[PDB]
Amino acid sequence: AKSNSIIVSPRQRGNPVLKFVRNVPWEFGDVIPDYVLGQSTCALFLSLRYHNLHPDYIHGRLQSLGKNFALRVLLVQVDVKDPQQALKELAKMCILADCTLILAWSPEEAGRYLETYKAYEQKP
């Protein structure tokens, strides 16, 4: 009826964050975003290293949410030593796509953020 659990797409199964994500109930069900925290609130997982290799993945992700969801949080995970170029483009695109840019220096930061975000359900 309502998101009591985070719905994660199975394609992101095997990531360290899900491996230790446990504070909040979550399950796989394949959704348009990466982690859906609510029917109108979604979080995206974008590895900066992955964007660094494939920039188009995140753009299409945002295009899809553009109509589907209201509140869209983009969680970026830093993996490279010089992530500033990607962060610039990610931040700016967030302006254009109206998504909250969240930065994570590890899967830990990502996990704690997801868990605490859905535990509260408080907009950022």
Residues 48-84: b if buried by 16+ CB within 10 A, e if exposed: bebbeeeeeebeebbeebeeebebbbbbbbbbeeebe
DSSP annotation of 12 = G
Return the CATH architecture of domain 1-124.
3-Layer(aba) Sandwich (3.40)
Q: Closest by alpha carbon to 48, among 20, 82, 6?
A: 82
The full set of domain ranges for the chain reads 1-124
Please give the Cα distance from 95 to 17 (Å, whole number): 26
The H-or-E segment that residue 27 falls in is strand 26-28
Neighbours of 100 (CB within 10 A): 14
- DSSP result, 56-78: HHHHHHHHHHHHH-SEEEEEEE-
